[PDB]
Write a protein that binds this ligand. Structure first.
Ligand code: ADP
Ligand code: MG
Lengths: 244, 160, 78, 170, 131
């Protein structure tokens, strides 16, 4: 019994276990179950685990990274199916309120972060002067120091990438209305959400369809479950550009 | 950027495209000619492809350079895989770029199997992409090679 | 309202339909194409059904999007 | 009282004479004894008189506002109130944590949707001074403390009893 | 009504030439609801269209009806029934507000964050040509 014949039976057994749809079982349940089985097989203190608690620990809206497929089909192909699993697009992209939450650490410099914002802004925005429903992405960054966070925002404004954060002047309170109009503003390229308290306020001010695309490495943030979520582990910030 | 073009009106089998900036003049010379390929989308994974059928470049006293491109959709590209069919509709406006070499390669390298590929020519507007034909359907369905005198019809005949 | 389309001109065998909102982009892709079936009515009891023959979606600088659907009446639903 | 207010209006301000799109600077003395209410009435009088943002024009202009002598607690509170009453202003800080960008003061001067320009403190005022290229005039209005002005700029100094008489002169 | 018509004519711009119209807000106090409603009935019959945030019978106070009526050219002014509706529409209006008080014996209490003037008059008749 080789690896290729064991591939389709492990996919098929998890399909009717959760009674889910087609492409969830390929990457959202199988790759999640492969890590937690390996996380307890390599554990030298506990190996005998009942499968009753294995079901609930797997069924979370989280897509974790595993080293073994990244070595198998490589970085050109592992990120390729990650684009077609949860980042599917059509020709006509509807003007939805798309929220992009990316993990910023001190190990990743500004330069590997900046073109990811350029990748998100170019692919998920239509600031054409001819359209009537313009849309711009929402950007969230977390896990970084405020000095490094303001350092990134300063250099974005110097190369003509105009954004808003709900702070139109120095000393302003957080007004989410300027975030709302910047979504429909053609001169505002994207929206920069500063904090979590900044984040939780602007869902309540949005009546249109909302979407969250989380791309993180270590720590996840508890986004409310009734929004559509895409939570994806990556190794470093360089992979996030190739998925969006 | 180098080119700033977008679709201003669509038809069942035709798109009107207006070029707004056209900063680099070398894009218009080879990549905006009649019969060339344009990428019509707002993202970089799913797009329409279009043959340029006609264009009209009007200039005047004070108003801007009126560059209009008439294009017809030939199919769909999804993650580097080309699908034939003009049934897909692009809602305007859609950002228009000349197609990169990988899409044009994927036009002819997808509908024909790798063992069925019979290459004897390359595309006129883009030399770097070779055009293979389905050598099965090339010879069963008979070949009618047509040209004027001195056009190269016999040189084409012998090269096949 | 996902769709807002409405007849603006009537011929003996031709209709002019103007789409005003087009909130859902998915309706235009597979339900507003040529050969699709349109329901022309002011109620949900008696209607006219139509074949879409032609369409044109123009966009310009300041004013709104002009989506014009050319259809022909093909029958009556009671 | 009435005859006092008449003299400084005619002598220094000349509201009807000056209609040219110049970068006019209004430096005001904000103190703790003056509430936010009478400050807002002055700012609305400055913006209505010394700006032209009508659609018929081709050379729009907006005044520059600077406040000194007050704490930052009520300076930001006045700024927060002014934004809520749809009096859109810029002060060189388009986002949180930004450095002072004088180019936002350059573009907001010619922007019709931007009613006036705020300046937080002294070194912000000195930095945009080298960023304006066109002719600038400073109209300093003060009660007890006067601010230094560069000697190469057209400057007027007007002394008032308190902040209430100020909107009458403007 | 002569004071209301003078306030309406002087302090509104409902012409079609402008792009930023405005209408005054009217408040009355010290009187009973019997003649307050009778005044409201007489104004509506003389084509002086107003609103008070009560578009239908048995309605909760809707401050956004005074918001649209401020910018509506077909609504000449905005009525306010009493103090509780006055403070409710105060927090709903974001743009600059001024309070103009014309009282003879009893003066209402205005919040100290608004630019307010108080006018003492001998009767109601001389209020008309002050505005
Ligand atoms: N693939 C090609 N690339 C460039 N020139 C070509 C090619 N094939 C033919 N020609 C040119 O076309 C010219 C005409 O020859 P040919 O087409 O054989 O004439 P005819 O079709 O009348 O017999 C030749 O002189 C040759 O240089
Ligand atoms: Mg020959």
């Amino acid at each position: 019994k080789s690896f290729d014949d064991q591939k389709k039976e492990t996919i098929q057994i998890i399909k009717n276990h959760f009674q889910c749809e087609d492409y969830e079982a390929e990457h959202y349940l199988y790759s999640n179950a492969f890590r937690k089985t390996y996380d307890i097989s390599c554990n030298k203190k506990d190996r005998r685990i009942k499968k009753s608690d294995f079901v609930e620990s797997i069924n979370k809206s989280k897509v974790l990274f595993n080293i073994w497929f990244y070595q198998y089909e490589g970085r050109k192909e592992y990120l390729r199916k990650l684009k077609e699993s949860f980042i599917r697009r059509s020709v006509n992209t509807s003007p939805y309120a798309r929220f992009f939450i990316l993990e910023f650490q001190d190990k990743t410099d500004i330069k590997t972060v900046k073109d990811c914002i350029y990748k998100i802004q170019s692919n998920w925005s239509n600031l054409s002067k001819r359209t009537d429903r313009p849309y711009s992405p929402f950007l969230l960054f977390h896990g970084t120091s405020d000095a490094n966070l303001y350092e990134l925002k300063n250099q974005l404004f110097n190369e003509d990438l105009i954004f808003t954060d709900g702070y139109p002047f120095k000393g302003s309170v957080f007004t989410p209305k300027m975030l709302i109009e910047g979504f429909s503003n053609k001169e505002i390229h994207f929206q920069f959400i500063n904090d979590i308290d900044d984040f939780n306020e602007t869902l309540n001010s949005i009546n249109i369809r909302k979407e969250v695309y989380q791309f993180y490495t270590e720590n996840c943030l508890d986004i409310p479950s009734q929004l559509p979520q895409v939570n994806i582990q990556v190794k470093d910030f360089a992979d996030i550009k190739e998925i969006v | 950027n180098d080119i700033n073009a977008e679709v201003v009106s669509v038809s069942p089998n035709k798109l009107k495209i207006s070029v707004d900036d056209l900063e680099e003049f070398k894009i218009a010379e080879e990549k905006l000619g009649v019969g060339s390929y344009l990428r019509v989308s707002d993202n970089q994974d799913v797009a329409l492809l279009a043959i340029i059928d006609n264009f009209s470049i009007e200039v005047k006293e004070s108003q801007k350079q009126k560059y209009m491109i008439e294009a017809s959709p030939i199919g769909l590209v999804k993650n580097g895989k080309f699908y034939r069919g003009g049934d897909s509709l692009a809602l305007p406006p859609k950002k228009v770029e000349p197609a990169k070499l990988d899409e044009i390669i994927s036009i002819y390298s997808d509908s024909i199997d790798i063992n069925d590929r019979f290459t004897f020519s390359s595309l006129s507007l883009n030399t770097k992409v070779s055009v293979p034909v389905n050598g099965n359907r090339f010879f069963n369905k008979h070949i009618a090679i047509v040209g004027s005198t001195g056009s190269g019809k016999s040189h084409t005949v012998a090269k096949i």
